[PDB]
Design a protein around this ligand. Structure first.
Ligand SMILES: O[C@@H]1[C@@H](O)[C@H](O)OC[C@H]1O
Ligand SMILES: O[C@@H]1[C@@H](O)[C@H](O)OC[C@H]1O
Ligand SMILES: O[C@@H]1[C@@H](O)[C@H](O)OC[C@H]1O
Ligand SMILES: O[C@@H]1[C@@H](O)[C@H](O)OC[C@H]1O
Ligand SMILES: O[C@@H]1[C@@H](O)[C@H](O)OC[C@H]1O
Ligand SMILES: O[C@@H]1[C@@H](O)[C@H](O)OC[C@H]1O
Ligand SMILES: O[C@@H]1[C@@H](O)[C@H](O)OC[C@H]1O
Lengths: 482, 481, 101
């Protein structure tokens, strides 16, 4: 009925380290009052909130997306460089605010370096031009004596930043995007921007805009499939019903396979090995405004654990993913002027990124399944999922081959599950189970009670065959020495 | 590293009986000289080759597609009805032959009733018109007093034929097709024909043309997905290399999943439950002419078993498939004036169709896998497949629940595989294993030696766990209880 | 048109009925003459052709020796009907219309 069998000697594939990526837009309090707050007793000399910095370092960010998001489609990056006092205040059409530009390219890169993350910059294709994108790329990556490479050095950074990931536009299909485009328009433009940016720096990875419109995806793949590296996909989900939210892990799964099959059908893209960048994802269904301070609960964190487990099993198709977003706006972390809250969405990352290997190993799961019809997202779009499992898992090993990590999600809303687990060739040892859990599906952390939803550890005895009782609505990682 | 576990108590899903379909086109010797031969000593008095009839009955054809294929795109069905001597001779543009029309709609339906197959008629969208299609449908299915229903009665059949499966054009994308169309033309034309045909007879199922171009398939689904029931896919494969041929079962599989995902991406089609009709498939790489008398060897028959096993597992997504074609043209059966040959592609159907259940059960297979790059089809297209299995299986049960069938393909070219099998809750019993293979991968049947490649049987005893050795390049069905 | 007993039964797609065609052009014009009304005939642009509409006009309005003018006389009406009003298609924009455009 329920069971897990793992063989740590059958390596299936590597797990892309970039599935755990994050994203910070210039949206409400994500930057200003989130990661960046000049003059706060909580900030360092650079203006970086130190408490946020510690929480961010704890989740080991592999790459960080910036500055948008709808914001970037009317952003002129030159506004955000040089002495801060001289940066112009602009009106951001996306969120309708005065942007002071006091956080710009140089601060973003300093932020990435401080937390160890690869920067991932989206370009402005809404009011931007090719020249402007090339100059941004030259400023960031130029080693020679071009005007913009020199300008980076003049502003205090001689060595190039080497930004590796470049987002060729943001949601250019949507009517809400400044300078939005038809499919043919965007597909030609993606090819043109990408090809000339790679003439300047051929090492960059280019992410082109995908969505759910299959004609759109195909035009982009047909026109730019010979130069792009990823087609992107955005996924937002959720409703007040518990199962309706978490089962959308398996909706996402079918979306990703769909987009993979589109790639398979376009010869240049398939032969090039174009993949998918899931570069925006989260629960998002309760708030619709200029700030998007979505109050995540445990149900939503179990969704997030489900996606990360799904991404470990599918990272060959989706090697890059970015939760939207890191702080406040749809935020994993929520800040106030005098502290922070770590939401269960943050806790999902805290669990998995800290207890997971670099390679996926053969993992077979038996589980009961259910079918569901629900609504998702802010507009309550109907959906259905067939045969979602009540239990799922992915086993991984460390690079050196020393540790095994068995990640397990129990989606059951009410019953704990006593699961029998077999691990091929495993001695009898003690192991540690790290468990993300809380009292009810709607539980939250607050400033008052910051650990209602948290990760517990417990010692257990394991062997080639053992059992473990997995709490309902929980995610666990069983960490074993080999 | 190899093994099979079956649970007969766990019914995954039904197996659509229409995966075992066939197809006869007016092409070379498929019809004239194949199923039908006026004046052969081997034909009955209707002109049906009796030896062919017997070979066809034995594979229990669930549905038969006719009359094309490229031929139907310049075929006017009324040229084929009424007293034979008054039927006009026409030049067929597809294959460049004088078509006498002595085999026409009434003869095809007699043929189907004889073999027990559902007819599946493709209509002419190349030189044909909506009115002409509606007339065909009226003649076949009309129960009332309309001119064409009465004409059916006049020509000797008062009861409607009730043709259930209608093919809305054939390969309309291909420049080779008479009156070929753009994606947008064909998508609108498919919606127009289907909807009006369904106003006359709303119980019919409509197959629309699909292919490898995802834009084409998407236009068809967006425009006609509220009315069609399938979108079709044609798949031809093979090279001289054994692994290059049989691995393309798993290329087919990825192809089907793709079309399936395209359907999922168009709300009307997805919501309606539009499925795939694999209504032309076979090995086809050696010949390119207007006869297509491809000389199937056992390699090719292993591909065919591989497909049939794949369809058992995927018939929810592909409920309808038609081998192209039944006789001579790409033929599972090859006829000569004084007999017939049953190629190993025929034998694949002879095996599976006579040893298979209506319901698929839980079947888990452990197998080593291989990667391959090769060529396929007449123009030697390159392809690749990743992780094709050396061993595959599908277990099915009879509708009553009395009988279990475990179909197993061993694709391994050199080595027998000794496979442990578990079947949940099964007693000790005797069972029979039916096995299709031959002396080498290039083995053929001939007039002189008609059984080089044939199905042999062996009694074995079986239990909750047992073992069996599957010969290389073989397909076997373990029939239990 | 022609002897009623020889007129084909058709399935009308619009309203899904067997049309016997026992009321046709000659009966229609006779009914118009009876009530003193000008006939106004709509043509078929869905499954119809230019040739077909020209033949209907010839049959109704032809003064000469063309096939369809002679055919009108053969069925009983030597004098042309002179239909003045012709409807060039019907609701060809609507997706409910056969052969909409
Ligand atoms: O720059 C903006 C700031 O002024 C606003 O007050 O909160 C966040 C941003 O969208
Ligand atoms: O991701 C999209 C968001 O950026 C837009 O503002 O509203 C609709 C969402 O799909
Ligand atoms: O994408 C599809 C979704 O929109 C639907 O609700 O159910 C099937 C899915 O594969
Ligand atoms: O296909 C037929 C062909 O084999 C024959 O030789 O010419 C007549 C055709 O109808
Ligand atoms: O048409 C004839 C064919 O039916 C028979 O088998 O061989 C001789 C031919 O005259
Ligand atoms: O199926 C097609 C065939 O009918 C045509 O003649 O050649 C190309 C094939 O793909
Ligand atoms: O359709 C594709 C095929 O053409 C290629 O050879 O390899 C992968 C398949 O998805």
């Amino acid at each position: 009925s329920y069971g897990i069998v793992v063989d740590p000697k059958e390596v299936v594939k590597p797990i892309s380290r970039h599935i755990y990526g994050h994203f910070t837009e210039h949206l409400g309090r994500c930057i200003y009052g989130g990661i960046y707050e000049e003059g706060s007793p909580l900030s360092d000399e650079r203006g970086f909130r130190k408490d946020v910095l510690e929480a961010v370092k704890r989740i080991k960010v592999p790459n960080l997306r910036w500055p948008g998001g709808n914001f970037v489609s009317n952003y002129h990056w030159e506004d955000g460089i040089g002495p801060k006092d001289q940066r112009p205040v602009r009106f951001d059409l996306a969120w309708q605010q005065e942007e002071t530009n006091r956080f710009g390219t140089d601060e973003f890169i300093e932020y990435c370096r401080e937390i160890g993350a690869e920067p991932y910059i989206s370009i402005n294709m809404g009011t931007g031009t090719l020249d402007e994108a090339l100059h941004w790329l030259e400023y960031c990556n130029g080693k020679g004596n071009t005007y913009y490479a020199q300008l980076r050095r003049k502003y205090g950074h001689p060595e190039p930043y080497n930004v590796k990931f470049w987002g060729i536009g943001n949601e250019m299909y949507g009517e809400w995007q400044v300078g939005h485009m038809t499919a043919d328009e965007y597909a030609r433009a993606a090819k043109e921007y990408t090809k000339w940016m790679k003439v300047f720096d051929p090492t960059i990875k280019a992410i082109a805009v995908g969505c759910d419109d299959p004609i759109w995806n195909l035009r982009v793949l047909q026109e730019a499939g010979d130069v792009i590296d990823f087609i992107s996909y955005h996924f937002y989900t959720g409703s007040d019903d518990y199962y309706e939210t978490v089962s959308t892990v398996y909706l996402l799964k079918e979306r990703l396979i769909g987009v993979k099959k589109l790639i398979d059908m376009v010869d240049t893209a398939r032969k090039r090995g174009v993949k998918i960048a899931l570069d925006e994802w989260n629960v998002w269904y309760r708030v619709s405004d200029n700030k998007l301070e979505e109050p995540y609960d445990l149900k939503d964190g179990i969704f997030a654990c489900g996606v990360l487990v799904l991404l470990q099993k599918m990272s060959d198709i989706v090697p890059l993913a970015n939760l939207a977003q890191l702080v406040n706006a749809l935020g994993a972390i929520h800040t106030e002027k005098d502290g922070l809250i770590l939401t269960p969405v943050y806790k999902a990352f805290e669990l998995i990124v800290n207890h997971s290997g670099e390679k996926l190993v053969k993992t077979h799961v038996e589980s009961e399944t259910y079918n569901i019809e629900g609504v998702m997202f802010i507009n309550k779009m109907p959906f259905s999922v067939e045969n979602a499992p009540f239990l799922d898992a992915a086993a991984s090993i460390s690079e050196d081959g020393k540790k095994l990590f068995i990640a397990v999600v129990n989606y059951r809303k009410e019953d704990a599950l006593k699961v029998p687990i077999r691990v091929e060739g495993l001695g009898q040892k003690k192991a540690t189970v790290y468990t993300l859990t809380g009292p009810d599906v709607n539980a939250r952390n607050t400033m008052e009670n910051p650990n209602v939803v948290d990760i517990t550890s417990e010692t257990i005895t394991v062997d080639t065959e053992f059992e473990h009782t997995f709490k309902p609505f929980s995610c666990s990682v069983i960490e074993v020495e080999l």
